[PDB]
Amino acid sequence: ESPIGVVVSSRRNGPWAELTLVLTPQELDQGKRLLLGELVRVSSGGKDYVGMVLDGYYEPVGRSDPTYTLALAHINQVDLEKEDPWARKEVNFYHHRIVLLGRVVQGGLFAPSTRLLPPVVEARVYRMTEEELQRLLAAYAFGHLAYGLEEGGEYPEVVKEVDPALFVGRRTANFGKTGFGKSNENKVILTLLAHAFPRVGMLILDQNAEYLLQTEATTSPGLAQAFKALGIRGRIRFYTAREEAWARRLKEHLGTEWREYVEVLPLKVDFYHFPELAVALAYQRRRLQGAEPPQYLENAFYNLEDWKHIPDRMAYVYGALRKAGLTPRKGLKIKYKNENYDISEEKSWGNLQEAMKGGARELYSRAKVFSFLRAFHAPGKEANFLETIKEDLLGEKTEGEGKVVILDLPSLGEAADFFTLRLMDLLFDRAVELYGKRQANFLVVLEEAHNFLEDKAGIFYRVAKEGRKYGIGMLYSTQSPASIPMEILSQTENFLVKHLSSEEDVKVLKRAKAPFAFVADFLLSEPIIGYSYVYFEPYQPFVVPLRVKLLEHVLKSLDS
Amino acid sequence: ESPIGVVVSSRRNGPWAELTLVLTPQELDQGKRLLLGELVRVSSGGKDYVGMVLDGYYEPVGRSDPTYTLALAHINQVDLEKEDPWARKEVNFYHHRIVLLGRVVQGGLFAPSTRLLPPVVEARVYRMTEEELQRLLAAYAFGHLAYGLEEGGEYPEVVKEVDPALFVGRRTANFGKTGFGKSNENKVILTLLAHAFPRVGMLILDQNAEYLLQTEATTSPGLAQAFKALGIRGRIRFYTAREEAWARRLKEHLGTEWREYVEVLPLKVDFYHFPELAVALAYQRRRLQGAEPPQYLENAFYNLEDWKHIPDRMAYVYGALRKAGLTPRKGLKIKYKNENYDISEEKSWGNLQEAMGGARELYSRAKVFSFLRAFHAPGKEANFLETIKEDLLGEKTEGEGKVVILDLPSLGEAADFFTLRLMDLLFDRAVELYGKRQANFLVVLEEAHNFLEDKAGIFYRVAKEGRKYGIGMLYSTQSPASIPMEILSQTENFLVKHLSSEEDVKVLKRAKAPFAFVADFLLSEPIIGYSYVYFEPYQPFVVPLRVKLLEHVLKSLDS
DNA sequence: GCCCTTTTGCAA
DNA sequence: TTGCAAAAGGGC
Numbered sequence A: 001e002s003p004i005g006v007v008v009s010s011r012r013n014g015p016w017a018e019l020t021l022v023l024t025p026q027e028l029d030q031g032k033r034l035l036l037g038e039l040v041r042v043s044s045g046g047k048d049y050v051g052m053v054l055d056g057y058y059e060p061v062g063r064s065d066p067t068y069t070l071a072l073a074h075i076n077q078v079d080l081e082k083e084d085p086w087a088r089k090e091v092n093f094y095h096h097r098i099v100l101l102g103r104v105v106q107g108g109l110f111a112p113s114t115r116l117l118p119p120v121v122e123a124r125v126y127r128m129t130e131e132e133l134q135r136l137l138a139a140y141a142f143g144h145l146a147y148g149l150e151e152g153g154e155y156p157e158v159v160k161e162v163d164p165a166l167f168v169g170r171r172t173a174n175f176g177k178t179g180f181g182k183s184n185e186n187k188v189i190l191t192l193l194a195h196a197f198p199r200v201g202m203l204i205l206d207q208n209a210e211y212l213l214q215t216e217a218t219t220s221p222g223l224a225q226a227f228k229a230l231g232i233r234g235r236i237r238f239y240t241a242r243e244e245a246w247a248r249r250l251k252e253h254l255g256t257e258w259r260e261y262v263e264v265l266p267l268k269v270d271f272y273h274f275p276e277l278a279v280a281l282a283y284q285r286r287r288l289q290g291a292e293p294p295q296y297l298e299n300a301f302y303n304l305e306d307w308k309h310i311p312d313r314m315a316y317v318y319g320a321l322r323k324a325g326l327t328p329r330k331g332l333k334i335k336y337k338n339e340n341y342d343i344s345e346e347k348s349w350g351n352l353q354e355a356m357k358g359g360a361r362e363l364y365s366r367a368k369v370f371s372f373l374r375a376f377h378a379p380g381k382e383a384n385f386l387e388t389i390k391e392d393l394l395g396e397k398t399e400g401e402g403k404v405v406i407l408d409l410p411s412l413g414e415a416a417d418f419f420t421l422r423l424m425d426l427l428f429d430r431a432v433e434l435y436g437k438r439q440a441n442f443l444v445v446l447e448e449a450h451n452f453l454e455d456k457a458g459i460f461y462r463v464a465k466e467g468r469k470y471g472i473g474m475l476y477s478t479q480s481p482a483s484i485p486m487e488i489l490s491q492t493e494n495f496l497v498k499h500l501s502s503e504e505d506v507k508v509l510k511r512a513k514a515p516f517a518f519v520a521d522f523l524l525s526e527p528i529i530g531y532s533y534v535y536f537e538p539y540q541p542f543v544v545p546l547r548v549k550l551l552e553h554v555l556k557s558l559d560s
Numbered sequence B: 001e002s003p004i005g006v007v008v009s010s011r012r013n014g015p016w017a018e019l020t021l022v023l024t025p026q027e028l029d030q031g032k033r034l035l036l037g038e039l040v041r042v043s044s045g046g047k048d049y050v051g052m053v054l055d056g057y058y059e060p061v062g063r064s065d066p067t068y069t070l071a072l073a074h075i076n077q078v079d080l081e082k083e084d085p086w087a088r089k090e091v092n093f094y095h096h097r098i099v100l101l102g103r104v105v106q107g108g109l110f111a112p113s114t115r116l117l118p119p120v121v122e123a124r125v126y127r128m129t130e131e132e133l134q135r136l137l138a139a140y141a142f143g144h145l146a147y148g149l150e151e152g153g154e155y156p157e158v159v160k161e162v163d164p165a166l167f168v169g170r171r172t173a174n175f176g177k178t179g180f181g182k183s184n185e186n187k188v189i190l191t192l193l194a195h196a197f198p199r200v201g202m203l204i205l206d207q208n209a210e211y212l213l214q215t216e217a218t219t220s221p222g223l224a225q226a227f228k229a230l231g232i233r234g235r236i237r238f239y240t241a242r243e244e245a246w247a248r249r250l251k252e253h254l255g256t257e258w259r260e261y262v263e264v265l266p267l268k269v270d271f272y273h274f275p276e277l278a279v280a281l282a283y284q285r286r287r288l289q290g291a292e293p294p295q296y297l298e299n300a301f302y303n304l305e306d307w308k309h310i311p312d313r314m315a316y317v318y319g320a321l322r323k324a325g326l327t328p329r330k331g332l333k334i335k336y337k338n339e340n341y342d343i344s345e346e347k348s349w350g351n352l353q354e355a356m357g358g359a360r361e362l363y364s365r366a367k368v369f370s371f372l373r374a375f376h377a378p379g380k381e382a383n384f385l386e387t388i389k390e391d392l393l394g395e396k397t398e399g400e401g402k403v404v405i406l407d408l409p410s411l412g413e414a415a416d417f418f419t420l421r422l423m424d425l426l427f428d429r430a431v432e433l434y435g436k437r438q439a440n441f442l443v444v445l446e447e448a449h450n451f452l453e454d455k456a457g458i459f460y461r462v463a464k465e466g467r468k469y470g471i472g473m474l475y476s477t478q479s480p481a482s483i484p485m486e487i488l489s490q491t492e493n494f495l496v497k498h499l500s501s502e503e504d505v506k507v508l509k510r511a512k513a514p515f516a517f518v519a520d521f522l523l524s525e526p527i528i529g530y531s532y533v534y535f536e537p538y539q540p541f542v543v544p545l546r547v548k549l550l551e552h553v554l555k556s557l558d559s
Numbered sequence C: 001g002c003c004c005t006t007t008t009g010c011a012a
Numbered sequence D: 001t002t003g004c005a006a007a008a009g010g011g012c
């Protein structure tokens, strides 16, 4: 209820205003202290500012020689707190430096910095109450305010809550050394969003096989286990090429009713049912590559729909698929001229090949251009998982349904990169096509993003630049700010930063966002696991230190 | 049990907290001193911190003129000690700077640094005892605490112990200039791990041919000799292309029963027995060098399994292998059309070649297989890539623990491709096995600057993603500046010997902040076997150790 | 990493 | 017989 110290000086140091505070022997003897990085209230001219404690140093006050006095007391062996109160009362001062960050105005908005420097005689500094801190953070907890690991510097009641307005339609970056909590942070945010706001969809690109089932003691549990614990049914769609191994695994950990929580789907299709899909994939593979699809590929890409009415034209497409190595289902009848062959049988295949046009004959001749499709082909599938995912995420059925689509990238081997690029392109094109009718309203979860946001001409770069218009959020983790382009870093809205050991990383971070210049020293020298610095635009344009929650504790606590 | 001096000031300097200590005439007369780099205890507000002595200088205390006083005493032949005790009490002061490293939490983890700056009247500084130091380092000795070469800074009873939790799933950097003990440190750590925790596997990429046998006086013995000394049997798998020479050396230097300790396997295979492996290697080469595989290679890669059931396609595959220069075993027969040939004979080889599609294009582009000559040997019939994969990640090999050593020089110029292929295969298998068994093995590589850069980033991926699967890295480079910051910023354990260059210490400090406190010691103290160690997050501060010789470790352990 | 150079088929 | 395409290796 009273000022902590006395303000004795103030100035403008660069783009910020700073002031000097002095703590007296009485206040120090009452146990009053100020922690570095602590948030305080500054009253000046009838206006309230938020301030941060930056520095602290000892300096003599008045006419005194603290060194001589203390050395003499030590030499003569006098207990300074019991024999010489007046000697103890002339050296027990302490100095602090406080920077003004801005002030809260009108409807919770933040006015940054200031043009008015406060005179010393009329400036006061106050300890901030939990109600004030709660208002500061607010205008399903994910973390709570903390200062380092000091006792008394923890505020379990001051929390930052998850809210779809914070994440959907906006870009979030998750940085930190390996082993410090990026994946746990992501999973806690996603579980809270799924539990509290069930109309938000997620597209998780799982490259390490950890976001569905995770039983080893090296990470937090998976989303399937979290959803089973919280009683969330029928919201996970898992795509994989190991649909039998994963089905076996799910039954040991989710029990006999695992199908109520997870739906396993294959990443394989029958290309004798989707020749247009085969041709489109072969055509797009080269655009995603350097450049210049061939003329015989553009011709097919544009005219295969026309060809479908001509059995002679379609016979050459099926022959190209069969010659590239794709296995047909037993009893597949191909009609040529005035005869029907069974390509599944070697004798009929040879007969038709010997017995065998708008550009389809060139496609048949250059059949080895389809061999890569054999990484996706499986006879008897007839699914088109690309379209299946498209209506999972952007289907008109939703208008708010909630769909967590998890892609098991490793199972695809060396086709995963091409598959990811193609799927992202399709989803973004559909989202653009639906503009003005419905919003996408889903979040792309992207780990090790430095492999996706490198080239400016990439679909992921384009999504990061233009997803806010169409309602697509992005949440990307990289372990190192220096791995991300500065153009993306500067345009990112939300930041969640754990410990970074390198000076270059913190320099890049503060070069991207100025307010991050006040925590670089803490980041460099405090390796604490699960301790985050969070920054949100435009309502919390300043860094706040949060202690993040374990997913196990969150699950055990949300049952109440 | 009493404070050393008096604290006269404190402040925040950069990311750390410092305080100033003054030593008085009585304490200086009693002989009490503080060594630079010594660890002390700081008591403040009922809490104990660990501090390090960083600086020391002489400064006048009070209103005095030490220069004039001392000069006058020297001029007037005045012996201060015996004649003027009062003039000697006003000049005999000394100053020290102490940095607060952090706070030890009993029943908990060390808390680094501090946000609370101590007032100068409430801080005390104490000397740390042997029990306190032992407790600090505890949270099979590998080294013992030592401060320089000064007498009284030697603590043989305060030791740092090898623990699998410090090394498995983590990265350890070993730096130092030539001849200062990096290889000895590596061998001591590996021998202690093998002896005490036999459930950890190792993959050593021996680029210098020193980790199996070492009989010269220019380095310490090898792992085979250490294991023979300690009685460890049936744990070393040695792969080489010089099997006969290495068997002769092993017999000569380990006796007749050397086969109970080392099992020697070749790095050669018969490609007429593994045509699918030949095609896979040819296909993976392009990706490993950053390019995109051609259509005729993707066709074979995806379709050779089907082709194996068609003798007409298999004839072209074998013809391509024979055209590339791969020697078949004596008496091999082909079955082109409904006829049989003997490609091992130069007559029927030409007969088939003149008597002669996906396989036809492979036969026409046969020169794509010539590099396989580096690994081909007729009549071998054992896939060494699969054998190594089973050794490191087997269903039953889990537990026992296996030490695989790769004799890289014997492969000549194919070693780079072999190493990249093996690492990619092992990482893919480890990722696929996530949830059923943990990899739990340590990749050991010397001259790491030659490995930690390549197209497709295989070693970058291993370093940045191996923690989840329990894949540890132990890489020695001899110069920090030669390691990318992308990999330096993900390292947890550091072991640094003397570095002469200024840029080396600057890079090390930029990579890990606390190493700013020992850079000046490193720059000016060339001591062999003196290592500064740092372990996150159990010991997040630099501790100076004297490391043991493997020769002495073996004698100590034999009992 | 990117810009020549070659064998091979389809045409007219 | 030559122009034109298309895939692939080699030189820079």
Ligand SMILES: Nc1ncnc2c1ncn2[C@@H]1O[C@H](COP(=O)(O)OP(=O)(O)NP(=O)(O)O)[C@@H](O)[C@H]1O
Residues within 6 Å of the ligand: A176, A177, A178, A179, A180, A181, A182, A183, A184, A185, A217, A218, A219, A220, A479, A529, A530, A531, A548, A549, A550, B464, B465, B467, B468
């Ligand atoms: N908030 C937290 N509180 C306590 N322990 C935590 C917290 N977050 C993470 N951990 C611990 O850190 C371990 C690894 O967490 P993890 O989420 O995998 O970090 P990470 O940043 O993803 N490492 P990586 O993905 O390899 O770069 C967990 O198994 C926990 O033991």
Ligand SMILES: Nc1ncnc2c1ncn2[C@@H]1O[C@H](COP(=O)(O)OP(=O)(O)NP(=O)(O)O)[C@@H](O)[C@H]1O
Residues within 6 Å of the ligand: B176, B177, B178, B179, B180, B181, B182, B183, B184, B185, B217, B218, B219, B220, B478, B528, B529, B530, B546, B547, B548, B549
């Ligand atoms: N801890 C130690 N105590 C005493 N002598 C040691 C110690 N470590 C190394 N030496 C001596 O130094 C020599 C060289 O050791 P070594 O381990 O090969 O250093 P190095 O770092 O590997 N030099 P290099 O690998 O050639 O760049 C040994 O043969 C010993 O004579």
